[PDB]
């Protein structure tokens, strides 16, 4: 027998008490290449993979529920498929800084774990990694969301086709409970090539021009966004030179003739999840202009 | 000292040995309503939520890595916010069949756990559930992907605005290791209202017409797909009656005047992730036609 | 007891992937596991309605020269419903293996181990424990003639006589058929995106669970609409390895196909005819 | 030792959400936790560069009549970077609470507990342990004047003198500014989707990390382009509760704003001016 109050009180009991930790692990292919005989000149950077949960598929999904993750174990396997008579050499190693962009044989052998071997032999690279707790959501500083990157370079000239596959065996612990939308979980990518407005087409441009191993082998229909604005020289149609400012790109698949592919600029309307295309570039007697400089950061924004 | 073979052998060691089980749990709001005074007539089905990992947000993400899940514990809390002088009553209960569509007070009280209470009191519904292992990927039979659904009905007429919130406290074990794309993890939805071709507009139609509590409170820009084809009567433009066949819809948000909203038919191009709109419906002296019958299953296909 | 245990080793399937064809990802066998596919068990199943899997292993068995230098990934996906052939999906499964084309390997899956039906039905999670997919991981240098063997043991439960056209696995489309992809009388099998359909022999007949609408004309500038439920496979060759499908009428009594009406395209609006996830049972006898 | 421990209880913020305004989801306080926001700690932080959090709890404290019958959800999100105010996001955090508007509650978060900086910097995961968001869960019947209190203890490490305009939390845009949303001289604050900006007082000045391009004309039918880096908040009222922003020039020496050029729209192609994730620091003194 209790009295009738003005208002009863809340009985929302179990709240805010979600599962906290998960250890989780597996083995994931982190890249695959195929090199035709002539290609594979000394030093050709066959692979460069920045490690982030997202790259390890199974992990990538779990990481959308917690805010931190910390690496407990990593190894990579190299496992090219090729017969004994191939006379080329590779060198792999895990660079513990995810920002480091200089890929030389010399800079890998320097890394702990680094391996060197003729194409017909497999190899295991037991690297050195942070084992501290990084973040699952991408951020401004990369040093905090990734433990480093795995690169593999050619060492001689392959006599024949090389079918390399590079597997990463991982185990990791997810620390903090939270809900992270799949847009923010993507890894940022730095260009290593200047985009001139003399090197253009009316509505697109080459992906090899940007000089980035990820953006080169990036998939189709894939909407990106940039930190730096893109300057498009358009016209009213009186011979008039006007100026347009777009922030977003769209990847189109490449060719056997054009290894890397295209990139159509435009507008990524996020409220409605759609992608408009960008205005007709006005070819003109306009002074030469770098529209996007070396080091432009491109972060994937569309639904994954 | 080993000899040089024709081909060395594979050294892909740790493969196919991923993490297998995860227990995981939390508490999630499963719906929220607000009922203005007049609304809330006896029996008004205020809530009807089919339970699936996806509905429990944190869980929904983990479920994309395993193939089965099995429920270890469930309770729901009811927790309306309203002051003591509101004189209306509700009745909640968890229907252990996810297909059961008859929502009567009588059919809830029948369920184990079911509760009855005036709006100003909170309640906990400790239900009966399968505790067997269901599947995370949606399938043809629903009985196998969901343990049932939680419905809440009005019991009198609310004198005042009712702000109910319904929280589900869950704990579940994910059984089987695998990678499931977010398109297949969505829950299917059955319409409970016939769509006549007399009740139409040139390019859209009402969402209340379908008579489905989910499709009514479904979000904006949300592309669906159907099991049954949709028959659109179009024209060549000579007074000609031609026939068109579309499989896909698009949700547009609703009004204070139109509670539920619109639905624009069309084409969901999945290769490229885009949505074209459907042709101008030809209004004509055409015999009355049910385009989509009661019980049409609508499964969400766009990126989540 | 009334239950019958049966065990054996049997070839699930055999592909030849010729020289140079095939590239990372190329699905070289995609086999939905049901007793019909397992030869000796095939006949045992025709007798009872229900089977349950006791043991399952696949032994991969590829045949090529030692210098072949390609590669494959194999594994067993437990969801006969899951329709995702990517490497990533496979590498996620238990059992999964990777090797060079000259190396046999044994995949050791995990499977339902519960009581399933012999004859096909709506929900195919009760007809099958899963499916095995084997993919290319590189480009194969040589002709490889891969023969995937399955060692199996099972328990068969209630005696029955089973119609053999019913025992077969339903095949699902992976790609949409658009109206603007139809030729006058046929279309390319590859459009449907399905390896089992692409490799189904010449003259296979399939029933669809969704209507195939064919716009046609009398030749008066007048567009009319027809409906069809059956396809006939016309074999693929070097020029068109996927082959072709003609729509038409399957007569179930006489077991004969009659080709349907010609497609007439006349300024029609864009249309989806056969959405992805269209189900295609083999109805013709084998 | 050189390190200084300091503890107190302080009001993080105070909102009034008036009668009938506010609906499930409506963010009523979104406060990025940095020492400036915590009053007494505010001054302590101006002296050292580095602080570390020892204890943190927020006590919610809403004030209304007992018959108010709305509701709120509160919680503390550990990622100053994470920009997601939904209930689902909050309910996922540790500490999270729910109550009727007349009930105080105490959120008990989990936080970084590591060594952070006092002055703002590029990566704001080193300036803050996270942010607290409190949302509506129903429609509030009455005026509620919620005052959220924080009991805190901290360790301050290296002595320093700190510029107070630098100590402030950067605010991030949640919505894009489109060119076709500009008025001649201003635009509506609500377009940027940010509660802290929407409630920033009249006359607040903000610097952007991205250029605001303004197309203008001389009045000859000739379109020209200007660039601006500063905004001034013009206070919101009942008709436009979010208020408005004028672009222009902030003079950092004289601490004065000069309004910029008028926007001229003349058959321009669709453009994104300020994409979502544009960063907006408070530069004007307080
Ligand atoms: Ca985060
Ligand atoms: Ca599945
Ligand atoms: Ca049977
Ligand atoms: Ca400082």
Residue numbers in the entry:
A (entry chain CN), B (entry chain CN): 34 to 337
C (entry chain BN), D (entry chain BN): 52 to 337
Which text from the study accompanies this structure?
Here we report protein crystal structures of a piscine betanodavirus, the Grouper nervous necrosis virus (GNNV), in four different forms. The overall topological structure of the GNNV CP consists of the N-terminal arm (N-arm) (residues 34−51), the shell domain (S-domain) (residues 52−213), the linker region (residues 214−220) and the protrusion domain (P-domain) (residues 221−338). The S-domain comprises an eight-stranded anti-parallel β-sandwich with three short α-helices, which is a canonical structural feature similar to other virus CPs. The P-domain folds into an independent structure, including eight anti-parallel β-strands and a short α-helix connected with loops of various lengths.
We determine the crystal structure of the T = 3 GNNV-LP using the ab initio method with non-crystallographic symmetry (NCS) averaging and refine the structure to 3.6 Å. The electron density of the icosahedral asymmetric unit (iASU) of the T = 3 GNNV-LP allows modeling of residues 52−338 for subunits A and B, and residues 34−338 for subunit C. The rest of the N-terminal segment of each subunit, which contains N-ARM, the positively charged arginine-rich motif 23RRRANNRRRSN33, is disordered. The ordered N-arm exists along the icosahedral two-fold (I2) interface of the inner surface, and extends its N-terminus to the icosahedral three-fold (I3) axis to form a β-annulus. Residues 36−41 from subunits C1, C10 and C12 are engaged through hydrogen bonding to form a β-annulus structure around the I3 axis. Sixty trimeric S-domains participate in inter-subunit contacts, forming a continuous thin shell of the capsid with an empty inner cavity. Three neighboring P-domains per iASU embrace one another at the quasi three-fold (Q3) axes to form 60 protrusions on the particle surface. There are three S-domains per iASU, and they all share the same calcium-binding structures to facilitate subunit-subunit interactions, similar to those seen in the CP of some RNA plant viruses, such as tombusvirus (DxDxxD) and SeMV (DxxD). The flat conformation of the subunit-C/C dimer is stabilized by two ordered N-arms alone, in contrast to alphanodavirus, where incorporation of the encapsidated RNA participates in the T = 3 quaternary organization. Although the structure of the P-domain can be readily assigned, the protrusions of the GNNV-LP show too poor electron density after NCS-averaging to allow a complete characterization of the morphology of the P-domain, which might be caused by the high flexibility. In addition, a structural comparison reveals that the truncated P-domain contains the rigid P-domain with the disordered linker region, and this linker region of T = 3 GNNV-LP also exhibits large B-factor values. This analysis may provide insights into why the flexible linker region allows the entire solid P-domain to be malleable, resulting in the broken electron density of the P-domain with large B-factor values for the T = 3 GNNV-LP.
